[PDB]
Amino acid sequence: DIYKAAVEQLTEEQKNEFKAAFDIFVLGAEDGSISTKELGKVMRMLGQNPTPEELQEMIDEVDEDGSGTVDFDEFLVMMVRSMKGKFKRPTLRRVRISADAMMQALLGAR
Ligand SMILES: [Ca+2]
């Protein structure tokens, strides 16, 4: 359930971006979920030559409810699992601390 907590942290733009990708995977599917047939076609389009066992094990790992297919909610958990600003937030903090330290040196001067 720990991966489901980070799903709610995703922005509206990230969820819409992932939905667009998911839609390409399920374009050939009648039930709106990714089966080995859809996965195999996508894998072959990307230049891969997967075996049937490879396709089944890929689906099985991200398939939480044993349906043999991947739905959008399971797809989102899979995306969050692979995403496990190092520069931006701490740098903006250090720059603010520096500007504050300069203002403190000024106002605090005798
Ligand atoms: Ca499933």
DSSP string, 18-46: HHHHHHHHTTT-SSSSB-HHHHHHHHHHT
Per DSSP, the three-state class of 14 is helix
For residues 43 and 12, give the distance between their C-alpha atoms in angstroms, rounded to a whole number: 27
Q: What's the CA-to-centroid distance between 49 and ligand 1, angstroms?
A: 24
Q: What's the CA-to-centroid distance between 46 and ligand 1, angstroms?
A: 23
Residue 60 assigned as binding residue = no
Measured in Å, how far apart are the chain's first and last C-alpha atoms? 58
Say if CB 75 and CB 22 are below 8 A apart.
Answer: yes
Ligand 1 ion local residues (Cβ < 5 A): 63, 65, 67
Q: Which residue has the tokens 């039930």?
A: 31
Say if CB 45 and CB 51 are below 8 A apart.
Answer: no
Paired tokens of 6: 């980070």
Method: X-ray
Per DSSP, the three-state class of 5 is helix
Q: What's the CA-to-centroid distance between 5 and ligand 1, angstroms?
A: 19
Residue 69 assigned as binding residue = yes
For residues 58 and 61, give the distance between their C-alpha atoms in angstroms, rounded to a whole number: 6
Q: Give the CB-side neighbour count of residue 23, counting CA atoms within 13 A.
A: 6
Paired tokens of 48: 């891969």
DSSP for 47-101 reads T----HHHHHHHHHHH-TTS-SSB-HHHHHHHHHHHT--TTHHHHHHHHHHHHHH
Q: What's the CA-to-centroid distance between 30 and ligand 1, angstroms?
A: 15
Breaks in the chain after (C-N > 2.5 angstroms): 84
CATH 1.10.238.10 correct for 2-84: yes
Paired tokens of 10: 């995703």
Residue 100 assigned as binding residue = no
Phi, psi at 70, each rounded to 5°? -110, 120
